[PDB]
Amino acid sequence: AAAIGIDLGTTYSCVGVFQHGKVEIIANDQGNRTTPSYVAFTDTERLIGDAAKNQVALNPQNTVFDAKRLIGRKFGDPVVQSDMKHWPFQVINDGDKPKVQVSYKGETKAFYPEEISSMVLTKMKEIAEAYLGYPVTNAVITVPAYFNDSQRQATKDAGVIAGLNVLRIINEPTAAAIAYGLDRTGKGERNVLIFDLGGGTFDVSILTIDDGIFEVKATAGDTHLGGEDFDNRLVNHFVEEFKRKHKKDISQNKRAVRRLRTACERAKRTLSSSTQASLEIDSLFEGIDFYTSITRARFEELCSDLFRSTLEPVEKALRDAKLDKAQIHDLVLVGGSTRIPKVQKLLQDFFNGRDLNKSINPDEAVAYGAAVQAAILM
Ligand SMILES: Nc1ncnc2c1ncn2[C@@H]1O[C@H](COP(=O)(O)OP(=O)(O)O)[C@@H](O)[C@H]1O
Ligand SMILES: [Mg+2]
């Protein structure tokens, strides 16, 4: 019985297993090595992952996402109230506990955030099981370093609802450090900086590792900065461009904007390894095709202030840990947005030419570390 490592992410989740000496990051049924943290409810079925995200434009009120922003928080919580204003789905109050309310098979039903996340965890569990060819009952699940007891508990519960014995709940930055084998240094304190630019959040952590024991020395960043913000700059740019070429504003067509958003995210992803990208959407708005392109340099310009803003939390965390740039032994890249060449440059330049540990797919580093730790704990 291999136990599994699960990164239960805000925007994407990832599952790994350590067996026969190495970590396998397990692809899902569509061949994707990470899976959106999305759960959809329709007249006839419950969809999770890619199947949920791939119908988001068609079903906005009953496609749930961002459950991680609610998990283990009270309804009265100001982050909750505030985050609520921007979701297309209803959150409601059940004894100061938030529930996401949707319609499923024709009826209004309401779920706790840990219930939604348990459906994502079940999907990651079944992904793992399809590959291993047996049931998985033990898992290590990861959380942000700043998660309080009640968010850790609610995440553990999500695991238990999913039919997993949760061997441990560990910090995301520690799991990334474990992935790179930094946990096995000894006697001396090593200082490690995790730079984590994901889909919805930006986390900088400084850890000190001394004879295998981790200490979180500083944390910083921005809980609303991530790849979604870069998708948006691109969306706004192409909306303006559509207006220029056809004198038509797609702004208010919720469906056109979501399909444009989708095309942008995919274009963006291509710009991490190519210097130009094709954007081709059939019948975007009133039967008008939108066939166009964008360069890495143009996308960089559109995002230049957001990209730069990531170095301020780095300065802050260094200050709060009372360390200079030159006392950081290792720079680890985590999150899919750190595949962006400009971002790697900014961080490497900030650190005066220092290597970045980026050999492990950054959107997988946390799951990789969880999988290593799960095997150890077993
Ligand atoms: N090659 C790439 N270039 C730029 N962004 C990417 C790339 N691959 C994935 N992403 C982005 O990474 C983000 C998801 O990051 P990930 O670490 O998987 O999830 P999470 O933030 O939920 O932990 C998304 O915004 C996605 O578009
Ligand atoms: Mg992440």
Numbering used by the authors: 4 to 381
Reproduce the article's own wording on this structure.
The 70-kDa heat shock proteins (Hsp70) are chaperones with central roles in processes that involve polypeptide remodeling events. Hsp70 proteins consist of two major functional domains: an N-terminal nucleotide binding domain (NBD) with ATPase activity, and a C-terminal substrate binding domain (SBD). We present the first crystal structures of four human Hsp70 isoforms, those of the NBDs of HSPA1L, HSPA2, HSPA5 and HSPA6.
We also produced the NBD of HSPA1A, the structure of which has been determined previously. All five NBDs crystallized in the presence of ADP and either MgCl2 or MnCl2. We conclude that at least HSPA1A, HSPA1L, and HSPA2 bound ATP in the expression host, hydrolyzed their bound ATP, and subsequently during crystallization never released the products of ATP hydrolysis into solution. Despite different nucleotides and divalent cations present during protein purification and crystallization these structures are highly similar to the crystal structure of HSPA1A and other previously determined Hsp70 NBDs.
